[PDB]
Structure formats: C-alpha cells, structure tokens
Amino acid sequence: MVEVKKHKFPGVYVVIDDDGSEKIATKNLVPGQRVYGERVIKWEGEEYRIWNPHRSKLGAAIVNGLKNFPIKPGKSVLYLGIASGTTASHVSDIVGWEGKIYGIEFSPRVLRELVPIVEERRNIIPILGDATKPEEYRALVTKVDVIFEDVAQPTQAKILIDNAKAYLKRGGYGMIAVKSRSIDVTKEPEQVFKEVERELSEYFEVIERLNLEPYEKDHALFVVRKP
Template sequence: MKLLNNKFPGIYYEKRKRMRLYTKNLTPGEKVYGERLKRKKDEEYREWDPRRSKLAAAILKRISQVGLNVNDSVLYLGASTGTTVSHISDIVGDKGFIFALDFAPRVMRDLVFLSEKRKNIAPVLADATQPRKFLHLVSEVDFLYQDVAQKNQAEIFIKNASTFLKPGGFAFLCVKSRSEDVTKSPKKVYSKVRDKLEKEMIVADFRILDPYEKDHCVFICKKK
C-alpha cells in the first residue's frame, strides 16, 4: 500500500483489478459505515467507498488536486451521517479539526456519536444558507467542503467561503444537478455553476462523477 501521490497526503491506494482507496484509521478497530479494515504492519486502514463519498469518487476520476492537508481545519457543509467526514477526520489527523454542519436533527445524532469517538470532529446543527447565524460556532478554516443538495448551491458555497475560508484556502463543491434545476441538462447546470464560481474564486479543477454518482459533479476552488 503506497501513498497515492504527494498532492493527496493521508490518502493511500491498493491496486488490484481496480484501484481501492484507503485512509489510516484514526480510531483503530472502529468502523463507521461497515467499511473494510485492512492492517499493514502496525497500522490499520479503512477502505474508502467511492459510491458513498464524492471526494473518493473525484480522486478516482483523477481530479488534479484536492487542497486538503494533514492538520487542516475544515468546515464541512452537509455532513449527513458522517461517511466522508470520517475519512477527512483520518486525513487531517488528531491535530486537525472538522466542523461538521448539517441542518437535519435526525443525522445530528449520528454525528454526535461519531464525535465521541473522533475528537477532531465537532457537530454543528445549523443551516448552511445562513452562515452569519453560526459565526459564533465556527472559526476560520483551511478547507471548505460542501455537499448540500438544494437550489443555489454555488451561492451557498461562495457565501461560506467568503465568511470562513482563509485567503488562499481550497474549497470543494459537490453539485447535484437535479437539485439545482431539474428542467435543464446536467451539462448546462454545471456550466452555469462554473460561471458563478469564476466570478468570485479560482476554479482549479472540475470532474463529472459518473458512474459513481449520477448527475453529480465537483469543483475544486481556491479563494483569491
């Protein structure tokens, strides 16, 4: 098992019939979503399922950079039950930190349980569309991740990047085209989102996630 490449610290791969991604388990012996655990010498790794994580899917789609580093502070918008959050927790390590935000009380319970085992995660019950309302709960961060399936995804992303992301920091946006506009083709939706992003940020890369996620794409951006 080797480091994928020096652009993606904390991410490992194993190549057999297909490439499998892993992160080093911050809490050895513990699974988060039923993933496979693999031991190598004295270390334990968790397999990262690209059909359950858009970040993993983007890496397998050969996105050129992610911008996430060991020890980073992260704001994750749309944390859900914590699948991708847990792998980011592995990557940033015990000196990094994640503000895992979601507006749904039903998933907050899972995030609270996850944070009890992973001390670098803080669950935040809040609405990503109103960042001013959780200013007192979230500090400035190195990396922003957004996976919020609703209208105005680019506007929400830009607003939070402006509020919380450090200058020069990277941000990762997942776009679900059907949530943005069901009447338009995914290609047109992605183009419109890109136009909005380029007015405010540097778009470093873009990937469509088929076949891992239908009608989804991701943008990796850098704050000016």
C-alpha cells in the same frame, strides 16, 4: 494477496487485494472504530479504512483521478452537509489530530449518528445548522483552510460563496460536489455546470472540475480558490 502502498495525496493510500482490483483507503485515526460498515485491513500493526467511492462523493472524485486535493493533514475544513460523517470520517483520517473539522448538518436525526463517533474522533465538531444561514453558527467555528460542500440545495452556489466570504481563509480552497438536477431539474446538466462554474468564477478562481461518472449521475466536483 492484500497489499497497501502510498498515494499521490497525503493521507490517502492505494490498496489492491484478493480480487486483484485496486482501491482507495485512509489511515484509521481511531483504531477499532467503524463509521459506516467500511472495510478495514491491517497493513502492519496499523489500520486502514477502505474509502468506498460508492458511498462517498469525494471518494469517487479521487478514484476518478481528481487533480487538486486541498484537504491535507493539519488543515482546518468547514464541511457543509456533514450528514452521518461517512466521507467526513475519511477527511478526519487525513486531516489528522492537528486538523480541525466543523461539520454542519440541517437534519438532526442524521447529524445524531455522527455525535457518538466524535467522542473518540474529537477531530470533528458536529454542529446542527443550516448552510444557508451561516451566521447562525458564527460563534461555533473559526476561519478554515478548506470548505467542503455537499448539500441538496438549489442555492448551492451562493451557499459556498456565502460561507466562503465568512469563514474561508483568503487564498483558501473550496470543494463543492454539484448535483445538476438539484439546481434545475429541467435544464441540461452541461448547461447547468456551465452556469454554476460561471457564478463561482465571479468570486473564485475555479481550479478544477471533475465528473463523478460512473459513480454519480450528472454530478460534478468543483475545486476553487479564494482570491
């Protein structure tokens, strides 16, 4: 009994199947292309990719009732920590052919998997780089609407600010998935999130904060806006 329907956010689709459960999904921008062994269902001559919240943080955030979702069609996003492109393949679906995605990734063997995908998904520019040194990829990107960060780095906070005060369009959005134990393995999660939010308020206008449980332990997706 597969059935698809629109979702609050443009590009995102809701879908309930056989098991009666409801799931998230997106419109496959490159029909026939699979990125991470995702589940795909044809609605009506069109292909939808089931956005698995267990494989994507952004996914879990949406599933957990995320309020603000800056990533809309035609938007330009600077994705720090693009890795293999699992969750970035969905923002591709969303952002669509008018949207642009500058993906940065430090680990080459990881960034390598995404390269073949961007051939047909010329939506994303896979860039090998280090989010702590934004200059080293200054010639490869342009000011973006949204910055999406998901890096295993203690410096996480400044990274978003550094990259924002260099590539984020003023009055632009920023989404960072923060892992408490990445910043301070000793401190308490709630103690940490309180500081990451403070530090972020010194430059941004923290517009939301959502926990990723039960999908992620001690993780929090923040969304902010550039003054």
